[PDB]
Symmetry: D2
Subunit: 423 residues, 4 copies
């Protein structure tokens, strides 16, 4: 049944045959003979799943363990939305367990929050925090700001010249010309106040803008390119060294995100009755405040933390992000959180808690939210896709849910640390 290389090549070149007639072992025979490269297996094979099966068989003979791919699943998966959009060189998928904590009573609504994780007790802990919040009358949240950023670096011949460009961008007329260029690229491109910083002849420009319900990194990048092109017309000696000069700052810890915000800035709060702190959280209000000051404030201060004044916001942010099709790498900046706790009520025995997260980078359209399983989790929360009547409302709601769930996670872990229940 296996044919030689030359007979198999004329069949593939045929416009009304292709690889359909050729067998599995026959296409792999063309790869080793080097007549067709490795990267020419996408647009030549008809179905996506068969292309995944061929990539896996070529891969298995390179690995030190032959049956390593055995328990990595690939069949019955919709690769149509993944190929040429979300992933390349695809050899299957990685199933991550999804649990549910809730109901989370947030802004007079009830949410069943999906959480994708492999850390034991995390879902159960977050659920216990939701239970305390619910018996305490619920939580309230506000989105304080909204605006994804990109922070290019440009170079002038001299620092005197870069100072000229900074001054020009600070005039109402200069900013207006740059804003028109930025806003011409997309419907949600709406440039907010510029933030500029000089380092000699370098100039770092932080462009900021809302992006509807998208996280908006591609949107902001397009607007930034157009704006810098317009800036070059007025200043032809300027060199665009990089569209990202790490001033954004994206996927790295940076004080600029902590202080200025990036994406959605959010605050959440709740009051937990003394009775609920006892019976649900197994501790006291006095014990909670004590651990919060000396762990989340003083402890993080001693550790030299910028933006890490919390117990484990990163656990909840990451779990929600993976379940809801977000960029999980943006957990770096999105986990920025300060958790504060005071005594409250008439007898000063109730627990006031608040979480403030100035840089939640989030979206309900684009990226991993285009995949159906991810959209199922977004649909649980009622935030799937773009909100037609109120652009950005679904992304803002998801950010509020993240902050609220983070607060629930902070309550439960801090109670366990305070009481010494570490089993």
């Amino acid at each position: 049944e296996p044919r030689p290389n030359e007979e198999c090549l004329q069949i593939l070149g045929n416009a009304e045959k292709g690889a359909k007639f050729l067998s599995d072992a026959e296409i792999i025979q063309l790869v080793n003979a080097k007549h067709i490269p490795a990267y020419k297996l996408e647009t030549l094979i008809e179905t996506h799943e068969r292309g995944v099966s061929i990539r896996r068989q070529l891969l298995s003979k390179k690995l030190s363990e032959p049956s390593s791919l055995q328990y990595l699943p690939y069949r019955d998966y919709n690769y149509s939305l993944v190929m040429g959009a979300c992933c390349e060189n695809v050899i299957g998928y990685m199933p991550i367990p999804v649990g549910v904590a809730g109901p989370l009573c947030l802004d007079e609504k009830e949410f069943q929050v999906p959480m994708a994780t492999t850390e034991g007790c995390l879902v159960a802990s977050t659920n216990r925090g939701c239970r305390a919040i619910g018996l305490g009358g619920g939580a309230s949240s506000r989105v304080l700001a909204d605006g994804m950023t990109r922070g290019p670096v440009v170079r002038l011949p001299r620092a005197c010249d870069s100072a000229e460009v900074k001054a020009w961008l600070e005039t109402s007329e200069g900013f207006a010309v740059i804003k028109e260029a930025f806003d011409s690229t997309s419907r949600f491109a709406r440039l907010q106040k510029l933030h500029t910083s000089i380092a000699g002849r370098n100039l770092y420009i932080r462009f900021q803008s809302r992006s509807g319900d998208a996280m908006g990194m591609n949107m902001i990048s397009k607007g930034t390119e157009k704006a810098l092109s317009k800036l070059h017309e007025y200043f032809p000696e300027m060199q665009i060294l990089a569209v990202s000069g790490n001033y954004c700052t994206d996927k790295k810890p940076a004080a600029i995100n902590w202080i200025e915000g990036r994406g959605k800035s959010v605050v959440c709060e709740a009051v937990i009755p003394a009775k609920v702190v006892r019976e649900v959280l197994k501790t006291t209000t006095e014990a909670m405040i004590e651990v919060n000051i000396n762990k989340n404030l003083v402890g993080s201060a001693m550790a030299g933390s910028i933006g890490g004044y919390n117990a484990h916001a990163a656990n909840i942010v990451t779990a929600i992000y993976i379940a809801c099709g977000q960029d999980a790498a943006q957990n770096v900046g999105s986990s920025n959180c300060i958790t504060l706790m005071e005594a409250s009520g008439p007898t000063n025995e109730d627990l006031y808690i608040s979480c403030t997260m100035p840089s939640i980078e989030i979206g309900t359209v684009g990226g991993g939210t285009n995949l159906l399983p991810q959209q199922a989790c977004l649909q649980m929360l009622g935030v799937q896709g773009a909100c037609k009547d109120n652009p950005g409302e679904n992304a803002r709601q998801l950010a509020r849910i993240v902050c609220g769930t983070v607060m629930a996670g902070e309550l439960s872990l801090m109670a366990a640390l305070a009481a010494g229940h570490l089993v």
Copy 2:
């Protein structure tokens, strides 16, 4: 069959010969709704794990504004045996993350096919392009510089003079020997390194550090810390243990202490990319790459007020490999710490020297998510699955080196695209 009356369903349930297996899904749901079977007691009462997940989904679906929300969230034919009571609770299914492959990665005279779980377009292809440049330049070399997971509890004494006494006692050879004895008694892999202590008035933050074989070590180090603090309490009975973690570890938050002291595996990688390879693979020059690395990764991060963020996108690669290999993806916060350096090299000064230094890669090949079969498949691709019997910690060390090397590949490709303005996807 049709739903039988509630009295009949409760007789079959409490039979022992039949149980919940002889009831329908509809029959179990009507008992929970009428308050007979509590609701939370469905876990151990249902026979199989998959059917328990199915019932939880049906119950949950009636509480949603859109009851068909979970239709495309998969759940059937997945091995929940390893997940329940270990990795996840209140399980309603699983989330498929596409897995791409970036390789071969030539590192320490070996070749690696690196699994990467992501939904970010062009990331796997860009990483693969970086691997190509490294492979045509004679390969990369890496070293593990340090190894030791940490836990940083906060204890309190009545006064700062008392906490000072405890700090000094821990710094004596005799005091440290007693604490190391207690700590190391909790596990055969436990070997307590020198303690780092910091006072804040009457507070005392103690950073315990130790190897943990091939495990990431969080549980192991915490158990050691609990026993060590109990022993310290015998010598200082007035000491209060305020919290087993006082954020001095520091785990899953940005912190300068992880950058300066290290946490988990500290690793460095490097490679020389010939001038020809920089042109034909990366589509740029060595001069352009060095200019961007200085003014983006060093000066740019400096202007942004970054601690540990002196890189382009280490977090992208770290997160991808972590999700694929059953790691704690939340630990991307500190594990992504990286400084990328670039210099001219060779006789003509036209070749591109690059290094990536990552002082706090928190990683393991046993425990947690690495107990699941799918993420064991990805670990098996790299030859690092499970515990190494002949050399405890070698598998985890090897994985840390692959992360640093893959980050360096990703750094080369993205930095080349930024330098030359190849930003279209």
Copy 3:
């Protein structure tokens, strides 16, 4: 050694007073409880004698009563110090002042006074000035200007603090607060507010120019009036502290590095390859190598925010003490990133630049009211208020600081590059 009753008759005359008593009789009057330690400020006629008596009373409480022998105090103008600059004054502390120059900056020449006790600092800074002068001089620009104060207020809930933040961000709310702030002083002109929430806390960073003054007292007066006006719209608001460390004053803070505070400045020069070898005893290639791996990578490894330089703090502190500045503000004022590149047709010339986002400085008020300090300000042509262009003297002093820092950087970095650490 007349008795107490006789000495009190002299003190109560009006035509006699403490001038007709000896030091021993005044101290005899104090130690015996007849004239408590407080009235002596009024009763002793000259400030210098009040200082002498304070020293003699203090000397009896010391383990070594002869401790103050070499601390000088006579023939100093205490009239501008008492009730304004220092309390419980027992004398003055001479700090050596040297001169580094000429510093060729913006087509002018400056002789820069530097108060220090660190050997080789003035000579090194002087060597840096020579390198810049032979290279055609340095150029600088003030990029921003505005002192800040960062109070913390509190509301009953985070929802309420969020409402206050949104109100301040409307043009209508900001206008009302700006009008209240600007009413307090002729130079009070409020710039955009920066705000940050932490639960029910709201941190508000007020920023304004302040003419030639460093502007701490002026910004605080405007801030108090502004928060009073803000309370009229939000009566549940509690002003917890006029400074909630969000300014941030005299502490290390990323907010100063990123947003600036006081004067933000940049300076630059190009040093010919010839000048680098002959004056600085090194090469351009050696200098760039050291700058990258010390000031950038080294500072990064140390976990530094704003400390991307060699010793900006040496020069800042030296000039500040000499020119009557607040030396404690060296914490934030020394923030600096030093960059070095190859330059010219063969890449053998050395481009240097220093960027300092938070130079907190003034030429009126504080220690700049004292005559010796005004002497150093007068050397640089920046003493006092500039009538014709308010703020020009303080802005010029900021430019001189940044230029002198760049000179100091050049010289020390050259020494480190060549191994000339003698």
Copy 4:
């Protein structure tokens, strides 16, 4: 005024206008005028006259004093190109009750109310039973950067320094340079082919910069014998870190790490500090902890430690540029006592860079202020105890200053005039 012909012939016979005409005529170069003039005060006078004709206002120098000051200890040690001295007012805050003793603390400042405020905080501590302090660590550092051909080579050097035999060789070389040189455990950090090595040692009563730099140079020379491919790029690679803000100083310490504490009775908080214990804690949490956190501070968890550090440093002949890191401080406040109305305060300062010998502490006025505190010069019987005592005084005075300012901020007592 005679012509320039006869002036060639030593320098004491020629007048002031004669020597100045030699400078503007280029008879003798400027660098050959230092050793020729014998008397120091006259050498300063001539430099001032030369300088005057370069200034747009020659009269600017008139109120900058210079006469009657002993330049013998300044020249060739503390300052170059000397044109006079800058008088800074010194005031006294005390008695500061610290560790069963009482100190009269000198403070050189031009900030109105600083001494008076610190004095109030001292009064509160005194009536509250006094303060207690401890030196937790002691060791000045120098943090050179060296480079090897590759990162695998730098890794090899890091591993070698971590072995007991390798460290013992480097410690022997370091300790041979001085009697006070005792090298502690090395902290190292790689960045590719770079290797940053933090040398740390006690330095007797000296701040230690020159002693540590000499021991560091001998250590790196010895390291070069085992690794001849190693380039010493810079003796300071900013890893020390000296005179810049650095998290490594905050976490590992530098110089003296110190803690101080006190309990202020509720009555004393009301009557001396004019506030309440509850108001103080509320402000400390929300300003010094949360506020500093929102500002992105590393080590700046305090109100104005820098005011007190700077004032003491200038009065006592310290390097005032080292205020940058020496001011690092976290101020904590808690409810205390059985009433819970007493105020527990603590200040922790991990990186006080300080000394009682060398530098400005050689000058006699500076030594007078050190003599007030009983810490002037080297402690003969126990090296380092004078410098340790000064550090304890600084931490204690900072705490006094924290108490008074924080009370003023809490109560809203912000009027300077009264």
